[PDB]
Amino acid sequence: VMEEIIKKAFIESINNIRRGDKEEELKKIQEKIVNAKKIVVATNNQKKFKVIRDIMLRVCNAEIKMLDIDTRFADLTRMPALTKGLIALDIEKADLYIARGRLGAPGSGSMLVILDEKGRVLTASLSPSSVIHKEDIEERIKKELIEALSRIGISIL
Amino acid sequence: VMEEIIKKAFIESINNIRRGDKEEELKKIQEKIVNAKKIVVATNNQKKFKVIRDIMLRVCNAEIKMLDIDTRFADLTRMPALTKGLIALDIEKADLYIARGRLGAPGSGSMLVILDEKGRVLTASLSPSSVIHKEDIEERIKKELIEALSRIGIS
Ligand SMILES: Cc1c(O)nc(CC(=O)O)c(C)c1O
Ligand SMILES: Cc1c(O)nc(CC(=O)O)c(C)c1O
Structure with missing residues (x-):
């Protein structure tokens, strides 16, 4: 529908x-x-994965899995995060795909994006460059995911 | 370089x-x-152009121009804002391109993006669905542009 x-x-x-x-x-x-009952996180570090997983479990009752392959194969493309999401979509079956990477050109800060089963962008959130930021990554990822959910009206509470 | x-x-x-x-x-x-010496705003729109212009003239000393053609045709693509930016990039020359549109799918809120001469994404900012923030296009576009500049250290 x-x-x-x-x-x-x-x-x-x-x-x-x-x-x-x-x-x-x-x-x-x-x-x-x-x-959603199946979610794929397109990154290889487990820290990221745990943060995202436990956040998402309070919003949905999904099985949340990670990605065996590493996506540095996207850090040379124009929009690395999105590319990671699309790789994940290409090799893994899910109802949601969650990706985190560089927004665009080197220096552009970070982006977390959520894609559906057919590669549509449902929501996203951005963080300043880690260059100026200088804050922890788990908290920053938590901030990104929470903003991404909230901006489309989804409460983590 | x-x-x-x-x-x-x-x-x-x-x-x-x-x-x-x-x-x-x-x-x-x-x-x-x-x-930047030339900035192109990817819209035909009055409100938007003046809004973006007022910030950018105070951040740089560039000629800031609008688009004779309008980019509503990008609203059927996967990422309308980026597509708008690429249209502007495609038809007129500038050192900066500022585009604003829907982030992704219908209902996904909005995105403002800044591109260089070669279509590279330098910075961007996002807004909740207009369904949720019921503010209209000129308040949040300014918030978006200011956030987009600030997130990369520009005051
Ligand atoms: C490879 C890579 C990069 O060059 N830049 C960023 C954004 C940042 O540093 O905040 C990220 C997340 C990244 O994975
Ligand atoms: C056409 C269009 C659309 O369908 N959705 C949005 C995002 C929003 O309304 O929050 C925008 C900016 C838009 O230009």
Whole structure:
């Protein structure tokens, strides 16, 4: 049915009557996150994985697994985090894919992104460059994931 | 040149000794935005153009121009904002491109992005779905641009 809602949105864009996001779109996204039972985290360090896993378990009742392959094979692309997400989508079966990496060019800070079964971007969050930041990574990852969930109306509480 | 710094970064990644962003990279980004001489705003829109312009004229001493053509056609792609940025990049020349649109799928909130001459993503910022923050486009675009500049050390 997501295909249907997005189709409605696209029809609205075609007819030049679209004004931003619709409530049914957002609730479809939230329902998609909350009702997810399989989640893949596309990084090899387990710290990251634990943070993300335990956060996501309070939002959904999913099996959350990690990725055996390492994704440095994305640190040469234009948007590394997204590329990691797409690699994970290509080699692993899930209803949600969670990725974290560099936003764009070297120096651009960090991005965490959540993709669905067909590679659509559901939500994302950013952190300043670790260069200026100088704060811990687990707390920063927690901040990223919580903002990414909250900005689409999902409470970790 | 940015080509060299990025090449070194890529080399570190190849030899698997890369640890993250380095200060000469960030300094190259700041260097890139502050010393811009031309900035293109990827919109036909009044509100947006003036909003972005007012910040950017106070951060740099560039000619800041708008787009004769409008980029609503990007609202059917996977990441509309980036696509808008690439359209602007594709049809007119500048040292900076500022684009603003939907992050991803319908319902996913908004993204503002800043691109260099070669379409590289220098910085970006995100907003919750307009469904949730019921603020309209000019308050949060300013918040987005200011956040995007601040996150890379630009005041
Ligand atoms: C067309 C369009 C859309 O469908 N969604 C958004 C994000 C939002 O409404 O929060 C934007 C900015 C937009 O330009
Ligand atoms: C390889 C790599 C990089 O060059 N930059 C960043 C962003 C940062 O340093 O905050 C990340 C996360 C990263 O994995």
